[PDB]
A paper describes a structure:
Parkinson’s-disease-associated [name] kinase phosphorylates [name] and Rab10 to subvert their membrane trafficking functions in the formation of primary cilia. The C-terminal RH2 domain of RILPL2 encodes a Rab-binding domain (RBD) that adopts a parallel α-helical coiled-coil structure. Here, we show that recognition of pT72 involves a dual arginine motif involving R130 and R132 from the RH2 domain of RILPL2.
In addition to complexes, we also determined the structure of uncomplexed Rab8TE. The structure of Rab8TE reveals no significant conformational differences in the overall fold relative to the complex Rab8TE:RL2129. Although the structure of uncomplexed pRab8a-pT72 has not yet been determined, it is likely that phosphorylated Rabs do not undergo significant conformational changes upon complex formation with RILPL2.
Author numbering: 4 to 175
The structure:
Amino acid sequence: TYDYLFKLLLIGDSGVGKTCVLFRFSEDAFNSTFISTIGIDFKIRTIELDGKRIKLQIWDTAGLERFREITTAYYRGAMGIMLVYDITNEKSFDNIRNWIRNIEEHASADVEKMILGNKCDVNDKRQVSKERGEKLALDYGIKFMETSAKANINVENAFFTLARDIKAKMDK
Ligand SMILES: Nc1nc2c(ncn2[C@@H]2O[C@H](COP(=O)(O)OP(=O)(O)OP(=O)(O)O)[C@@H](O)[C@H]2O)c(=O)[nH]1
Ligand SMILES: [Mg+2]
């Protein structure tokens, strides 16, 4: 079985790497061919924290605008949300502010939030400095990490940290 079940959501503009982050976390693999998510998808992985078994039910939203009705319906049950942008795409970083408004208008007001700056293996095409990502997350009081699904950087750490913070809030 499991001791806790945490429903998690990945949100962010299309193309930032939500599906590849989840594929790395659930299957420890990376595919370079862009296959945009249609509607929604999910993966399930159970981790251990403090000797407790935490089942992570992770919903991978479709970032394309025409799927917003489906994304919105998945906000209510969520306990933690990854807000993903692409360090090579300034617009996806700008839009983190709008994804935050979306979360706070629909999700439970207590939902745990974390910002991921993905594709940090592509330093040659970086547009969003790490300093600016840290500052935005500081402005919102949110944790922040740069990740790479391709090189498997901070993917484990992002999900384990988010789960730990959800568990800490529950255990208090
Ligand atoms: N170099 C590099 N490329 C990445 C990384 N993560 C994702 N990509 C590439 O970025 C493209 C988009 O990745 P996806 O995971 O499909 O993006 P998404 O956010 O799920 O997009 P939608 O499903 O349309 O919302 C794909 O071609 C990936 O291979 C990464 O960490 N590093
Ligand atoms: Mg996807």
